[PDB]
Design a protein around this ligand. Sequence first.
Ligand SMILES: CC(=O)SCCNC(=O)CCNC(=O)[C@H](O)C(C)(C)COP(=O)(O)OP(=O)(O)OC[C@H]1O[C@@H](n2cnc3c(N)ncnc32)[C@H](O)[C@@H]1OP(=O)(O)O
Ligand SMILES: CC(=O)SCCNC(=O)CCNC(=O)[C@H](O)C(C)(C)COP(=O)(O)OP(=O)(O)OC[C@H]1O[C@@H](n2cnc3c(N)ncnc32)[C@H](O)[C@@H]1OP(=O)(O)O
Ligand SMILES: CC(=O)SCCNC(=O)CCNC(=O)[C@H](O)C(C)(C)COP(=O)(O)OP(=O)(O)OC[C@H]1O[C@@H](n2cnc3c(N)ncnc32)[C@H](O)[C@@H]1OP(=O)(O)O
Ligand SMILES: CC(=O)SCCNC(=O)CCNC(=O)[C@H](O)C(C)(C)COP(=O)(O)OP(=O)(O)OC[C@H]1O[C@@H](n2cnc3c(N)ncnc32)[C@H](O)[C@@H]1OP(=O)(O)O
Ligand SMILES: CC(=O)SCCNC(=O)CCNC(=O)[C@H](O)C(C)(C)COP(=O)(O)OP(=O)(O)OC[C@H]1O[C@@H](n2cnc3c(N)ncnc32)[C@H](O)[C@@H]1OP(=O)(O)O
Ligand SMILES: CC(=O)SCCNC(=O)CCNC(=O)[C@H](O)C(C)(C)COP(=O)(O)OP(=O)(O)OC[C@H]1O[C@@H](n2cnc3c(N)ncnc32)[C@H](O)[C@@H]1OP(=O)(O)O
Ligand SMILES: [Cl-]
Ligand SMILES: [Cl-]
Ligand SMILES: [Cl-]
Ligand SMILES: [Mg+2]
Lengths: 183, 183, 183, 183, 184, 182
Amino acid sequence: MSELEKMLKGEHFDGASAEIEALRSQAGRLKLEINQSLDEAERYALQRELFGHLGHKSCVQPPFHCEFGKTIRIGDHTFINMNVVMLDGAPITIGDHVLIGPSTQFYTASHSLDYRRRQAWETICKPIVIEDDVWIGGNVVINQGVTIGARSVVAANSVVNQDVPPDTLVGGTPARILRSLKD
Amino acid sequence: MSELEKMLKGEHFDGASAEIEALRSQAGRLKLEINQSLDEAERYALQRELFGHLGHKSCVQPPFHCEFGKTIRIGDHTFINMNVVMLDGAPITIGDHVLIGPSTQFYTASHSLDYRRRQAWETICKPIVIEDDVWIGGNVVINQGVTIGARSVVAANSVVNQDVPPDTLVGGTPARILRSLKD
Amino acid sequence: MSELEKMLKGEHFDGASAEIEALRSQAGRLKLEINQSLDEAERYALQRELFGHLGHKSCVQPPFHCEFGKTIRIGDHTFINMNVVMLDGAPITIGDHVLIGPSTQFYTASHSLDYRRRQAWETICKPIVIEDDVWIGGNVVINQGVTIGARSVVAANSVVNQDVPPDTLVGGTPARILRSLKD
Amino acid sequence: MSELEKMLKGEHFDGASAEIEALRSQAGRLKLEINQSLDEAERYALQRELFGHLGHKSCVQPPFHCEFGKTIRIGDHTFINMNVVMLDGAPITIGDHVLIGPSTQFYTASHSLDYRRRQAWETICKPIVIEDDVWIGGNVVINQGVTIGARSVVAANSVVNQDVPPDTLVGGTPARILRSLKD
Amino acid sequence: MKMSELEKMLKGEHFDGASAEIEALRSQAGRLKLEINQSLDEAERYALQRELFGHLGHKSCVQPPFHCEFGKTIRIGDHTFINMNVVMLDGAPITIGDHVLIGPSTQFYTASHSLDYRRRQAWETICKPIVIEDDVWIGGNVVINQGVTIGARSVVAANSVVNQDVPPDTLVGGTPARILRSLK
Amino acid sequence: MSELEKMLKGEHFDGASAEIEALRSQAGRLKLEINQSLDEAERYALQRELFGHLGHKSCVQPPFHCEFGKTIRIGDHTFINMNVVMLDGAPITIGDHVLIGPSTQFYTASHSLDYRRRQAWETICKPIVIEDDVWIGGNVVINQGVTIGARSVVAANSVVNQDVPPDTLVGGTPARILRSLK
Ligand SMILES: CC(=O)SCCNC(=O)CCNC(=O)[C@H](O)C(C)(C)COP(=O)(O)OP(=O)(O)OC[C@H]1O[C@@H](n2cnc3c(N)ncnc32)[C@H](O)[C@@H]1OP(=O)(O)O
Ligand SMILES: CC(=O)SCCNC(=O)CCNC(=O)[C@H](O)C(C)(C)COP(=O)(O)OP(=O)(O)OC[C@H]1O[C@@H](n2cnc3c(N)ncnc32)[C@H](O)[C@@H]1OP(=O)(O)O
Ligand SMILES: CC(=O)SCCNC(=O)CCNC(=O)[C@H](O)C(C)(C)COP(=O)(O)OP(=O)(O)OC[C@H]1O[C@@H](n2cnc3c(N)ncnc32)[C@H](O)[C@@H]1OP(=O)(O)O
Ligand SMILES: CC(=O)SCCNC(=O)CCNC(=O)[C@H](O)C(C)(C)COP(=O)(O)OP(=O)(O)OC[C@H]1O[C@@H](n2cnc3c(N)ncnc32)[C@H](O)[C@@H]1OP(=O)(O)O
Ligand SMILES: CC(=O)SCCNC(=O)CCNC(=O)[C@H](O)C(C)(C)COP(=O)(O)OP(=O)(O)OC[C@H]1O[C@@H](n2cnc3c(N)ncnc32)[C@H](O)[C@@H]1OP(=O)(O)O
Ligand SMILES: CC(=O)SCCNC(=O)CCNC(=O)[C@H](O)C(C)(C)COP(=O)(O)OP(=O)(O)OC[C@H]1O[C@@H](n2cnc3c(N)ncnc32)[C@H](O)[C@@H]1OP(=O)(O)O
Ligand SMILES: [Cl-]
Ligand SMILES: [Cl-]
Ligand SMILES: [Cl-]
Ligand SMILES: [Mg+2]
């Protein structure tokens, strides 16, 4: 098993592995051009090379930050605001009609509580999934292995450690259910 | 009203309008020039092109992020630190002698909690107001239609959802009164 | 002493002092070079002009933002993620085997709660220390004068106002002890 | 005719026409994005937006300098090297299998020898045509109203003021016929 | 005080180019050229060009990319146009008059070196001024060498090398330039 | 013999070959980074990455354009001015104390005069050697397979098609011997 594939699969891996490093450069180069670009069509085009998928009529405002990019998939009519950071060692999958606030963070990557197990920067990545019609506010942290339920809202500055059921407003750190949005 | 007029006045608006798109383009350019400037006098002069007003002896440290620029009006002797983000569809007014920490966020924009009214990226913008002699901590979120009262202070990482009384210290998410700064 | 010395030592100072201005200017030039660099070897080289110290096999990810650069000393086998903000008017010292996640804030700077004592942008700087094997999550604030004890972990979106003991997990705003990590 | 129509036929046009003006700015935008492009596919795309035409499997090496772009038509399998300047007030047409060396110059524009006929920057433009299978060396000038005959070769540092016949080697300032290439 | 290493250069004496004053001006001009060259706003391009140059006149225009070393030694009159890709080595004054037209890729060399390889090893350099008078048309890809004066209302043929003062009301061409016609 | 190897050594080659495309892409990124840098020590550091070699106390002024970079070796105390273009399919070797002026072009590459043999962009690259203490003026073309003898000088706007003897001043298009400097 490739170190790359180990990373995507939530197992231990070497980050200096070559195919991974290359992915990382591809990503570095693209961020810089996208981020320094004033042509809207030019940014979208380069994002189709940066991202795993970028859907129709979706927008991702610069500056946008990520580590690998190809792991990220964005559906249709989806909008991501400025200054978003995604640690994308594992797949990040984003639905349709999703809104994401500024300075929001997606961290697939994580570490062990035991310092003896972090001395080689050992990391595990688990995927994040944002379902359709979700609204994530600004300055939010969504941690690894979380799924956000459809038609749900995450309040500004929340930290989401666990799944968010659908049709729901949640808030805080860690996030809690504030109200049901179901009819 | 023109679509631009509606956005300013807290009405529903068409984001794709030519007038709104011109200002968005102006802002993007000036933003990029300001964030890449090595020359402090050049940066000031560019920031006087971006913002609607920027007062006497005031400093805004790059990188600064905004959408339109023109609706932002800052007083004299006011310091805004690095990595600030402002969503300025609605006017943002900042008094004299204001201190704003790094990575602070100003969102004049919000969306409906009802997901069916989010599909066309419907947005409502209401102004934000910072009065004289306010100190705002880092990583703070300030939400729409909010007025921060004179000589108050906001704790780091607070999120402000409603007006902050003057001569007051507030903190937390959402912010609550912590102490009286009155004398 | 010189104004630079006063700032370092925790006393009021003159931010526009030619010595302090010059170092701020150095850092701004170096920051734009590093943040815009597509070469890792050059980037690292660059960072060693920017910082007081960068350790062996240590690493800092673009973009990175600080005021002065030369107050910051970073040890070996340490990794700092993207989009970090450091207000470094006073020394910030970071040990070996240290991890810092994206968008974390280190503030050495502070002002007084009395607005009358803030109208000249008066500021005190207190040193921040991070001891070996510490793990700091994403979107965290560490405030002035704080030491984080060896082998401790700070949860995401925490605000740390006072020292953290060794072998501990802390979280919340303000951060509270969550659990001993010892044994 | 439209001012753009005048220009494509090589008729006199108003250079400060709303339409021309817009073309000149579009070209300036694209020149910048093209010249600062680090992505091959996106560079070709931008190039097809600049030029009137850019044929299948052809190449234009950055940096490239031009005025309007849309007046330039390039055939199939034609390579244009680095640092080329084209004054494109009137049409420039390049055929299939053409090779153009670094720093070459194409001037459709010139002025009267009567200095009193130059005080308003009065300029007359005349079309250039490069036929199929031509090799233009480096550092060459091709003046206005010139047709370069098919399968012909123009030596380095040469200046061409009049039509060059097919199957021919020219060289010199002004270029003269060195030898016949037919056999 | 006494003559600066910058004075020496402008005055065609031998100078140390590594001197702090010279480097600062080279640094300033490098910053301004980059900003000028990638600039997308017209009003802004002129403002910066006014920061680059010693003087830039009313209704005058310099098309990016433009290359120069020091900038401040350059002076340009009113109603003057300079096209793209022009390079100026401007260790000494460069003075351009009114109603001047300069083609693309034209080179202005105020700099020079001795033909004795022994006198070139510390990169010894002497700069002598260039002066272009009113109403002159210089073609594209022309080289103009140090200490040259192009008299008023003259024309330099494309890709010409001008080694020597050029008479007013004259058309010149070739390498080195020679008189093609009186235009009087 | 690989495609990179054939290029370097004056045979036809597949320019889309992955080795060649690798080097070109690295050169493209570095050139842009160098040309857009205001930090002289940075450009120089970046340049040690781009070129085969870059000697002590040597200066290469931006903008500088080349195709591959690694085929270029430049010695100590050598100065290359602005906006120089180098087509470097074959090795380009430059000595100590050399001076190159603005907009000079070095073309290691060439083509056939027979159009039938250019229809696939066929290209042959032959090296160029500039010896110690040479002074090359501005707007000069140096064609492939040419050596410039030590302590020689090249007049501005010349095209050099053939080797230039040591201690000589040459000029013209094509370059002719003007005077001995010996
Ligand atoms: C696409 C773009 O970029 S948009 C730009 C960025 N904009 C945003 O981030 C906006 C984020 N929106 C907010 O956070 C809002 O305050 C919303 C969505 C939670 C609105 O809350 P509302 O339901 O309308 O009102 P309300 O203030 O009563 O909230 C209810 C509860 O949420 C709590 N709450 C409100 N805001 C937050 C918050 N940010 N974090 C945690 N809890 C919160 C309140 O304490 C209250 O608690 P309770 O259960 O004890 O009564
Ligand atoms: C503007 C610039 O350029 S500087 C750059 C950025 N720096 C910062 O943002 C610093 C922000 N300043 C603050 O957070 C400060 O801690 C202040 C203004 C609240 C000072 O309060 P102090 O009285 O000096 O400190 P202290 O920690 O003892 O206050 C205690 C109480 O405040 C509350 N508190 C402190 N910090 C926070 C916080 N970030 N959020 C919410 N509550 C907080 C705690 O609840 C605490 O306990 P309590 O509930 O029992 O009262
Ligand atoms: C170097 C880098 O760039 S790579 C990775 C960067 N990513 C990170 O920032 C990830 C952040 N990780 C965290 O914050 C985690 O939530 C941790 C480490 C604090 C705890 O995770 P776990 O122990 O595995 O799970 P768990 O949710 O059960 O934690 C336990 C308790 O901590 C508390 N807690 C968890 N997260 C937080 C938080 N963000 N703020 C405050 N308290 C928290 C919880 O209340 C929980 O409940 P309890 O106190 O009642 O027992
Ligand atoms: C498209 C790209 O990316 S790659 C191309 C980059 N490189 C080039 O531009 C190289 C330029 N090409 C050349 O110069 C051609 O080979 C030519 C025109 C010199 C022809 O070379 P050949 O004639 O085969 O060689 P040769 O030197 O023996 O013949 C030269 C004859 O023309 C003359 N001559 C040679 N070069 C030139 C020139 N550049 N200008 C004018 N005359 C020339 C010589 O005087 C001689 O003429 P003469 O005998 O009548 O007096
Ligand atoms: C300002 C802008 O940006 S415009 C863009 C750039 N455009 C240009 O550079 C245009 C340049 N124009 C020229 O080079 C022309 O050759 C001009 C100016 C000399 C005009 O020539 P004209 O007077 O119209 O006609 P003509 O060609 O007959 O000129 C006659 C003499 O010039 C000579 N000549 C023409 N071009 C050159 C040249 N490049 N070098 C040397 N001599 C030349 C002819 O040999 C002829 O000589 P002769 O009669 O003594 O034997
Ligand atoms: C490192 C850097 O940045 S380089 C700085 C930039 N400076 C330059 O590029 C300067 C270029 N130098 C030249 O052009 C010079 O004019 C040189 C090399 C020809 C030297 O000329 P000098 O010997 O000093 O004097 P002079 O001008 O009288 O030259 C005499 C011969 O040169 C010829 N000549 C002058 N310039 C040239 C030229 N550009 N091409 C061909 N021949 C020339 C004359 O025709 C004359 O020939 P003749 O006597 O056979 O009729
Ligand atoms: Cl939409
Ligand atoms: Cl001809
Ligand atoms: Cl020197
Ligand atoms: Mg010629």
